[PDB]
Design an enzyme around this catalytic site. Structure first.
Site, PDB file in Angstrom:
ATOM      1  N   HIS A 221       0.849  -1.197   0.000  1.00  0.00           N
ATOM      2  CA  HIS A 221       0.000   0.000   0.000  1.00  0.00           C
ATOM      3  C   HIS A 221       0.898   1.266   0.000  1.00  0.00           C
ATOM      4  CE1 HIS A 221      -4.192  -1.611   1.236  1.00  0.00           C
ATOM      5  NE2 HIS A 221      -3.453  -2.658   0.934  1.00  0.00           N
TER       6      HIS A 221
ATOM      7  N   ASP B  54       7.706   5.616  -0.669  1.00  0.00           N
ATOM      8  CA  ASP B  54       8.277   6.893  -0.189  1.00  0.00           C
ATOM      9  C   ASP B  54       7.995   7.094   1.279  1.00  0.00           C
ATOM     10  OD1 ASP B  54       5.488   7.348  -0.269  1.00  0.00           O
ATOM     11  OD2 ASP B  54       5.628   9.200  -1.481  1.00  0.00           O
TER      12      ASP B  54
ATOM     13  N   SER C  17      -0.545 -15.990  -0.003  1.00  0.00           N
ATOM     14  CA  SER C  17      -0.201 -17.269   0.639  1.00  0.00           C
ATOM     15  C   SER C  17       0.075 -17.075   2.126  1.00  0.00           C
ATOM     16  CB  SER C  17       1.015 -17.920  -0.028  1.00  0.00           C
ATOM     17  OG  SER C  17       1.275 -19.212   0.539  1.00  0.00           O
TER      18      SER C  17
END
Ligand code: HEM
Ligand SMILES: *[C@@H]1O[C@H](CO)[C@@H](O[C@@H]2O[C@H](CO)[C@@H](O)[C@H](O)[C@H]2NC(C)=O)[C@H](O)[C@H]1NC(C)=O
Ligand SMILES: *[C@H]1O[C@H](CO)[C@@H](O)[C@H](O)[C@@H]1O
Ligand SMILES: [Ca+2]
Ligand SMILES: [Ca+2]
Ligand SMILES: [Mn+2]
Length: 357
Positions: A46, A64, A174
């Site tokens: 994200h 960043d 997974s």
């Protein structure tokens, strides 16, 4: 270089990452592929993916550290629901290990977490991302109700990723569970081995769904093949997006090609994470500190298997051109619970710091 601890390293700039790994492992991961490790791996994605070639740099700077440096902005977007926990867990390390940028801390913490998951690769780790950026705009994080066309486009716009690279990155499912998709249950796993970086999620998403681990009406969720849960041992959840990727013609053969192909899955994941971890940067301007990523736990080497209560007759196949592998089936007619905890129990609360997100 020789670091104050006596460790010999590639470059002196890599030295500070040794006590950071030790502190992360002692304080939030405990050398396990557990809840806090999983949440940090989700945060590497994200943070990195919020970047757009078409909108330009104002839309976001990629890998960043923006999630840590502007903790009241992106973590409150609906698509980032739940990301607050990982952000509040890593801000104290940013303050204490204060020669490492927020951006480098996020990517390195992701590599350290994945090294706790048997079968994972030892990620490349380049360092030197700046400690200044902007907050990203909303709409850049893929969501489980999105179509395959929308998902592939978002990854193309973020960093030129191919469909092969996109499915490769989804090997992280997974070792992944869901806390927000259903409001009645916590920690619903996406495969029956959420503490092992193996190919089970590729197999188990191709089985016919037979019920739901919680309610039947959540956005972004479809029926699961292994929905049984008890106590804290929640049943398996299936996202609409993983299901859609496993059956769409653009990605169905790539999805099936990782079933029972562990080393291929892990090397493909390493390669795509090499690209994801430097979004927003020129890789020729980052220094190579791969030698301070811990060596990952090895897998046992066992083949993928059908879980008890499932079999080859339950497969929903979508790749005409490749033979599905010959796999055994674990004995028993009824489903086995998927443990809440790595050591098999039901009780194993992870460390969680409070914070601004
Ligand atoms: C089309 C792409 C993707 C979508 C739509 C998607 C969606 C989601 C959803 C809905 C959750 C559950 C969150 C919650 O309710 O608690 C989740 C968890 C997770 N995702 Fe993905 N994801 C995708 C790509 C990725 C990628 C590329 C990575 C990393 C390389 C990643 C790593 C994870 C991890 C590790 C978790 C588990 C968090 C935990 O167990 O605490 N995801 N994902
Ligand atoms: C990167 O930026 C963060 C945020 O400005 C810096 O964090 C501060 O760090 C000092 C210690 O160096 C703490 O006293 C502050 O409380 C922190 N600020 C916040 C808002 O948490 C960090 O030091 C910077 N790191 C580098 C490598 O420059
Ligand atoms: C896991 O548990 C199930 C029953 O819940 C068995 O059928 C299986 O063999 C394994 O012991
Ligand atoms: Ca970011
Ligand atoms: Ca697994
Ligand atoms: Mn979680």
């Amino acid at each position: 270089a020789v670091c104050p601890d006596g460790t010999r390293v590639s470059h002196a700039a890599c030295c500070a990452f040794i006590p950071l790994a030790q502190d992360l492992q002692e304080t939030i991961f405990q050398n396990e592929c557990g809840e806090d490790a999983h949440e940090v791996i989700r945060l590497t994605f994200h943070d990195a993916i919020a970047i757009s070639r078409s909108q330009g740099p104002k839309a976001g700077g990629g890998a960043d550290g923006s999630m840590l440096l502007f903790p009241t902005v992106e973590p409150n977007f609906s698509a980032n629901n739940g990301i607050d926990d990982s952000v509040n867990n890593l801000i104290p390390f940013m303050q204490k290990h204060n020669t490492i940028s927020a951006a480098d801390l996020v990517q390195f913490a992701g590599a350290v977490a994945l090294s706790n998951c048997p079968g994972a690769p030892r990620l490349e780790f380049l360092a030197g991302r700046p400690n200044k950026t902007i907050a990203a705009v909303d709409g850049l994080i893929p969501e489980p109700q999105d179509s395959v066309t929308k998902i592939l486009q978002r990854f193309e716009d973020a960093g030129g990723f191919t469909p092969f690279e996109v499915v490769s990155l989804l090997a992280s499912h997974s070792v992944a569970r869901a806390d927000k998709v259903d409001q009645t249950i916590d920690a619903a796993p996406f495969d029956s081995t959420p503490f092992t970086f193996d190919t089970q999620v590729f197999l188990e998403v191709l089985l016919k769904g037979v019920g739901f681990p919680g309610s039947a009406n959540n956005t972004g969720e479809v029926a699961s093949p292994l929905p049984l849960g008890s106590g804290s041992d929640t049943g398996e959840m299936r996202l609409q997006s993983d299901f859609a990727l496993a059956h769409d013609p653009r990605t169905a053969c790539i999805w099936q090609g990782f079933v029972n192909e562990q080393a291929f899955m892990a090397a493909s994941f390493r390669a795509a994470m090499s690209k994801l971890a430097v979004l927003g940067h020129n890789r020729n301007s980052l220094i190579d500190c791969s030698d301070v990523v811990p060596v990952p736990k090895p897998a046992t080497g066992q083949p993928a298997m059908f879980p008890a209560s499932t079999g080859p007759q339950d497969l929903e196949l979508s790749c005409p051109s490749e033979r599905f592998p010959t796999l055994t089936t674990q004995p028993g007619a009824s489903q086995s619970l998927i443990a809440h905890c790595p050591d098999g129990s039901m009780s194993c609360p992870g460390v969680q710091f409070n914070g601004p997100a």
